Amino acid sequence: KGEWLPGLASPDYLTGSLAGDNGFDPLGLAEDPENLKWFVQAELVNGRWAMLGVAGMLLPEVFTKIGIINVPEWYDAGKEQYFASSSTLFVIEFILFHYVEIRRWQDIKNPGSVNQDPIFKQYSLPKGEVGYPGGIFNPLNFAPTQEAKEKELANGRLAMLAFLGFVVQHNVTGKGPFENLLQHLSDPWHNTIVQT
Amino acid sequence: PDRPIWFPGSTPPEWLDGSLPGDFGFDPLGLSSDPDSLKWNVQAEIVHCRWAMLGAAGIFIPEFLTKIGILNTPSWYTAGEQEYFTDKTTLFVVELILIGWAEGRRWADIIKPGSVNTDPVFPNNKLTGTDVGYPGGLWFDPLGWGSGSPAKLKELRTKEIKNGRLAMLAVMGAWFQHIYTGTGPIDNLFAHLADPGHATI
Amino acid sequence: MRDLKTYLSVAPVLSTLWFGSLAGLLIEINRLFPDALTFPF
Amino acid sequence: VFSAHFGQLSIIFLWLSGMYFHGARFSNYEAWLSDPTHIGPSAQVVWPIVGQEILNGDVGGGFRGIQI
Amino acid sequence: SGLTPCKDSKQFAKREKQQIKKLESSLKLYAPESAPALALNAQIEKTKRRFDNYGKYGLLCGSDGLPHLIVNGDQRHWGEFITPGILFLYIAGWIGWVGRSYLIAISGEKKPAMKEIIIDVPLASRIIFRGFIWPVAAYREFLNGDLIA
Ligand code: CLA
Ligand code: CLA
Ligand SMILES: CC(/C=C/C=C(C)/C=C/[C@@]12O[C@]1(C)C[C@@H](O)CC2(C)C)=C\C=C\C=C(C)\C=C\C=C(C)\C=C\[C@@]12O[C@]1(C)C[C@@H](O)CC2(C)C
Ligand SMILES: CC(/C=C/C=C(C)/C=C/[C@@]12O[C@]1(C)C[C@@H](O)CC2(C)C)=C\C=C\C=C(C)\C=C\C=C(C)\C=C\[C@@]12O[C@]1(C)C[C@@H](O)CC2(C)C
DSSP states (O other), X not given: OOOSSTTSOOOTTOOSOSTTXXXXXXXXXXXXXXXHHHHHHHHHHHHHHHHHHHHHHHHHHHXXXXXXXOOOOSGGGXXXXXXXXXXXXXXXXXXXXXHHHHHXXXXXXXXXXXXXXXXXXXXXXXXXXXXXXXGGGOTTOOOOOHHXXXXXXXXXXXXXXXXXXXXXXXXXXXXXXXXXXHHHHHSTTTSSTTTO | OOSOOSSTTSOOOTTOOSXXXXXXXXXXXOTTOSHHHXXXXXXXXXXXXXXXXXXXXXXXXXXXXXXXXXXXXXXXXXXXXXXOSSOHHHXXXXXXXXXXXHHHHHHHHHHSTTSSOBOSSOTTOBOOOOSTTOXXXXXXXXXXXXXXXXHHHHHHHHHHHHHXXXXXXXXXXXXXXXXXXXXXXXXXXXXXXXXXXXXXX | OHHHHHHHTBHHHHXXXXXXXXXXXXXXXXXXXXXXXXXXX | OHHHHHHHHHHHHHHHHHHHHHHHHSOOHHHHHHOTTTSOXXXXXXXXXXXXXXXXXXXXXXXXXXXX | OOOEEGGGOHHHHHHHHHHHHHHHHHXXXXXXXXXXXXHHHHHHHHHHHHHHHHHHTTOEEOTTSOXXXXXXXXXXXXXXXXXXXXXXXXXXXXXXXXXXXXXHHHTTSSSGGGGGTBOOHHHHHHHHHHGGGHHHHHHHHHHHTOSOO
């Protein structure tokens, strides 16, 4: 089992059965076993959403830079006009996300409670651990072994860090995310956080 | 028990039994009564002595070669004002990161010995040292001088510690000589040797 | 010595050290950002 | 009792040393000595931190401070 | 509410001018290069910058020429009371959580009263860092039911 700091004994409440475990808890936030489950689910959801956001706000910048397409940066996408008003799209989002989020919340409370379709009674998801619905959400039927879960959690943590870095990049420098990387490579020892 | 003491005819403290290398029973203030304090202070002294040997040789050797006429390097006091390819704060940050990894590994070794004796990424390579503060291994002890009869190890560690105390004193002396007289350390030595009686204050 | 550490951890000495550090810090901000009434951030 | 008296004597001597030193470095003693009647004695000076330097009045002799 | 901005307050300007005139009255008493004169010259600049900054932040002055604070919750005056309020609440919660967490740790000892006089510094240093996440910690502890005895 991995250790986040050699010479430091891991906390006892982290038995190592969970995926992506390294005994990292200096503040002891997961001392209560109940809090551990909620924190695990929150970490998973935040990781997935941050992964999607970082990918979707990094790739179009590269595509615009190379010359395949012409799309503005990630921060100024709000000024562009669309076929519907922003309030209308927000109303669609607010109604739409409520259903799925309440479904997930209901699963978190009672596992296996919402596995049955509410309109058509003959379709349902197979039993599984909470936070990994499986079934239709895994159309290719990949093996959900522990190694794949560890890979997912590691990528999620890296995505969280990357998103925070992107936000701080835009707040201070005021330039694009990929523009900064090219600026750093031109003169590595003269273009750094120290100068700015 | 019968080893030479710093103050002959006096009674050495009861927590200094002479087992440690370079022990002369000198602790009038009793700053190391507790065993943990003893171990921490021993590690601090060893690190200070090694850094002193590293620094002392880097101050007088360049100035000797400069005054003798071989090189032209500036004074050690003003070496922090010279031109460099990048701002000194960037160099400070890089140094901080590298020395941070090194000193963090060393700190992990002190608290829980034997916890950092294996290569994190190549488990084949290990370090063969057994005592804290003397890592050994191929990385640090290539010539095999760190292992042998206990008497030889004790004598070698004693001579290393004595050289370290001398180096620490010499480095502080160089600093104060240059703050006072306003010239290089070698110039002070030559001025003293020219007229030992009068060339002081 | 151990007694030196034990006497240094007693309530009055520790409280005085903490309050002195606190007062020094507060004077530092009051010197760095003098005559402050509103947050300009 | 003997040792307590010795400690009190030490404290008194420290107080006298402070009083004698402050009049040498932070005082207008010489200017007052050149004109005792029209100059107000002073031996204390305040740091300008929170606007408290208003206590440095014009006591005369080209000096600003608290009149003792 | 009948209040005018600082930048357009004739009484504010009069206060600034009067303070500067009073300060300059004592400057004429010393030689221009002297240390008291140098110290006095630094006071005038401080007053000028203070008045400029007060005018620049959109503070509201009444008929007196003195700024007033609006704490009703207006979005244009959140820096007066709302912004410093949350900071104070966070800091006070940090202090209270640290103090509460220290007492619980030593309550299980045989003589818990002895640790309230000779503070266990190695134990206290560990708890200090834990107060950074006090809002989350208290929110989670309230739901679980461990907040109240
Ligand atoms: C920082 C350097 C340093 C350190 C950590 C030590 C540490 C130690 N020495 Mg040591 N030593 C040093 C420098 C140092 N020495 C030097 C330069 C000399 C030559 C003069 C010696 C000569 C010496 C002898 C002869 C002996 C030791 C011994 C010991 C051990 C027991 C004493 C002890 O714990 O005191 C704690 C030591 C400290 C340095 C703690 C710091 C306390 C003071 C306050 C430091 C500041 C002093 C400074 C001059 C005051 C500045 C104020 C003002 C002038 C500005 C201990 C491991 C004894 C032993 O058994 O060795 C194994 C022993 O017999 N030392
Ligand atoms: C290795 C130790 C060492 C050595 C060899 C020297 C040597 C010298 N120092 Mg010196 N010095 C030292 C440490 C040392 N110092 C320290 C630690 C300080 C800070 C307190 C000073 C402060 C100092 C000043 C301010 C001046 C000198 C000067 C001098 C030179 C003239 C002699 C003199 O008046 O010194 C007097 C030395 C002292 C008052 C310090 C006491 C000696 C220390 C404690 C070491 C104790 C002796 C040592 C154990 C002997 C064994 C080593 C031996 C092989 C040399 C001479 C080359 C003068 C100069 O520039 O020459 C013109 C001068 O003005 N030194
Ligand atoms: C999810 C996430 C990001 C979501 C982003 C999305 C959707 C982006 C979307 C957009 O791009 C598109 C789509 C369009 C862009 O135009 C429009 C926007 C909207 C901009 C970030 C999480 C980001 C979360 C972060 C970074 C969290 C870091 C937390 C840390 C480190 C905790 C550390 C500790 O917790 C441990 C580690 C142990 C604890 O015991 C104690 C300590 C030590 C304290
Ligand atoms: C520790 C020290 C002094 C020691 C103090 C002593 C004796 C204390 C002794 C006692 O405690 C005992 C034992 C017992 C107690 O009961 C009593 C006292 C009396 C309290 C000296 C040096 C201590 C520290 C040293 C030696 C520092 C070294 C510095 C270096 C390496 C500098 C390197 C560079 O110079 C280069 C090479 C090139 C330049 O260009 C750049 C720079 C960076 C300047």
